[PDB]
């Protein structure tokens, strides 16, 4: 019953775009490729620093990255040694002057991407999938999500038959376009294969737009 992607169905309405720049068709593909590169590099580097959302925004032949992250202190390092290194590598990849900004995620128990990452990490290091998932749901509800759903899928506990299990708490109105549903995915590369994690977090119902 394949469901529409909640972010993509909500862009414009309640949700913003991650990349926010204009380009004509001459420069569009190149810009997209560069963004892909920068995002890939940044994720590879800052896998341990908990990174929720890279937001690329290029004006005037210059790139401005904005890393939404749970631990700024770890992204910045002391005196900004690592941010500076990152900035320069991003600049080389793009081919323009770079500028990195860092947005601090205060509640990473409500940030879907972060939650998914945590669950996947636990799965990889062989925690009980069910336990990890339950903990994730409880924590989000405790922090004050209006609702949360978590789904894990495939070869759970190294079982020969794959199956998907999911827990829901509160309300998660997926068909409501004005519903602020944060959503993301991750993949646990276990010894028996890939295990997919999806996480929906209903923050509330935005009425402004």
């Amino acid at each position: 019953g394949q469901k529409v992607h909640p972010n993509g169905i909500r862009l414009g309405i309640v949700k913003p775009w991650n990349s926010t720049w204009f380009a004509n068709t001459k420069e569009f593909a190149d810009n997209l490729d560069s963004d892909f590169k920068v995002r890939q590099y940044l994720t590879k580097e800052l896998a341990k620093a908990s990174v929720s959302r890279i937001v690329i925004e290029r004006p005037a032949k210059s790139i401005r990255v904005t890393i939404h992250t749970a631990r700024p202190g770890i992204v910045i390092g002391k005196k900004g040694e690592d941010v500076e290194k990152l900035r320069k590598v991003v600049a080389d990849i793009a081919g323009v002057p770079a500028q990195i900004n860092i947005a601090e995620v205060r509640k990473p128990e409500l940030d879907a991407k972060l939650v998914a990452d945590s669950i996947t990490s636990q799965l990889e290091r062989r925690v009980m999938f069910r336990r990890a998932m339950k903990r994730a749901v409880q924590n989000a509800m405790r922090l004050g999500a209006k609702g949360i759903k978590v789904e894990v899928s495939g070869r759970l506990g190294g079982a020969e038959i794959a199956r998907t299990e999911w827990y829901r708490e509160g309300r998660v109105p997926l068909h409501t376009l004005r519903a602020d549903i944060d959503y993301n995915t991750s993949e646990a590369h276990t010894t028996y294969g890939v295990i997919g994690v999806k996480v929906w977090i209903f923050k509330g119902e935005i009425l402004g737009g």
């Binding site: 204009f22 004509n24 925004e57 290029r58 004006p59 005037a60």
Partner: protein, 100 residues
């Protein structure tokens, strides 16, 4: 010798914000900007197959909408031209200042 400014953006709210800002700059700096005229939006539609392999009728139709705004300023003064040059706009809105 009027300065023409073409604003192009994917978001319409942003284009409105930019154009209003430009208008404010002109009207403050003493100039006769004609008006923020909305040119037509380009709805560039794309249609892709959603399945990784067969099933042809399963498809998604996306579209990018480019919004246009023509703002002309009549009589370029010193203050006006220099102000225009100084003022940098929002990143997500491509501006094109054609003098003539």
């Amino acid at each position: 010798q009027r300065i023409r400014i073409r604003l192009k953006a994917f978001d319409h709210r942003l284009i409105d914000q930019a154009t209003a800002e430009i208008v404010e700059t002109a009207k403050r700096t003493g100039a006769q900007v004609r008006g923020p005229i909305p040119l037509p939006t380009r709805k560039e539609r794309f249609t892709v197959l959603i399945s990784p392999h067969v099933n042809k009728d399963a498809r998604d139709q996306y579209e990018i909408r480019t919004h246009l705004r023509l703002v002309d300023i009549v009589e370029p003064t010193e203050k006006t031209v220099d102000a225009l040059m100084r003022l940098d706009l929002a990143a997500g809105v491509d501006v094109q200042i054609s003098l003539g």
